[PDB]
Design a protein around this ligand. Structure first.
Ligand code: SF4
Ligand code: SF4
Ligand code: FES
Lengths: 230, 56
């Protein structure tokens, strides 16, 4: 009755047809690591972290936006899956500056967690390390676009939820500045939400900026006020 | 050290172990400080093109 079997590590499970491989792995409990996927936005494929070795094929394919054919067998813990993840993680950490002391996401990074739990232990790339000059987006959001990994998630969030259309990719090669061209103060509603969209420390809060670091705090239940929805 | 031979002989006679030879007051073979700086070798990694973290 409209269910397709996937063999996640040999374990069979039923999946609604048309949905992604990644939702099947999250159904059985697996987390394939991801940087450009999010469970509220459209599914672009620009981060290359979601890869998986599907059997009987010489080519590793993505799992952020893969449709599910009948009767798969998914290997999330094979050899070249780990080699692809270590390779892509070594690619990401080249043009990314040493700011982990002063970056505002010491406890709440994503490069740090996934670089521990999937990445290499030694680096390379002795020269290089380009630098992008920052902008001044607004007095609400502090912005250093050097840490921007060009993951195209603020763009999709803006253009598909904010509806404002004031963010864009510019350029080619390494030189892809994600930002706003005309030096306009990007001011709209929900612009405070963009500092949790950005998975790296590139779009942080302006008044908060250098007052804590997220392992010292303790987290507490509460309810929204001054809005009728809560 | 810094003693005459009479009390030296009294030391070596009260305990016939040749106390003048080794006495646990070092004068010479204190290790000469301000040593040269070391260059630490790195073991079974920084070996390029084969250090696969999937392996080890
Ligand atoms: S986002 Fe910040 S904490 Fe994460 S790797 Fe970059 S500089 Fe370090
Ligand atoms: S600013 Fe942040 S969310 Fe936007 S593309 Fe760069 S890393 Fe991604
Ligand atoms: S999740 Fe970024 S490439 Fe599939």
């Amino acid at each position: 009755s409209n269910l397709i079997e996937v063999f996640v590590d040999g374990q069979s499970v039923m999946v609604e047809p048309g949905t992604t491989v990644l939702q099947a792995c999250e159904k059985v409990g697996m987390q394939i690591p991801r940087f450009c996927y999010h469970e509220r936005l459209s599914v672009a494929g620009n981060c290359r972290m979601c890869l998986v070795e599907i059997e009987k094929a010489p080519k590793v394919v993505a799992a952020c936006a893969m449709p599910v054919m009948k009767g798969w067998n998914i290997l999330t813990n094979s050899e070249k899956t780990k080699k692809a993840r270590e390779g892509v993680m070594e690619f990401l950490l080249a043009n990314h500056p040493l700011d982990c002391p002063i970056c505002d996401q010491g406890g709440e990074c994503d490069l740090q967690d996934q670089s521990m739990m999937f990445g290499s232990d030694r680096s390379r790339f002795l020269e290089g390390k380009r630098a992008v000059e920052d902008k001044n987006i607004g007095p609400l959001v502090k912005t250093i676009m050097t840490r921007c990994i060009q993951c195209t998630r603020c763009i999709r969030f803006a253009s598909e939820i904010a509806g404002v259309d004031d963010l864009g990719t510019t350029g080619r090669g390494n030189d892809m500045q994600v930002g706003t061209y005309i030096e306009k103060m990007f001011m709209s509603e929900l612009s405070g939400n963009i500092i949790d969209i950005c998975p790296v420390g590139a779009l942080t809060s302006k008044p908060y900026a250098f007052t804590a670091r997220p392992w010292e705090t303790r987290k507490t239940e509460s309810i929204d006020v001054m809005d009728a929805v809560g | 050290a810094s003693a005459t031979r009479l009390i030296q002989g009294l030391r070596n006679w009260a305990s016939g172990r040749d106390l003048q030879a080794k006495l646990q007051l070092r004068y010479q073979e204190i290790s000469k400080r301000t040593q040269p700086p070391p260059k630490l070798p790195v073991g079974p990694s920084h070996r390029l093109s084969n250090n696969y973290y999937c392996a080890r």
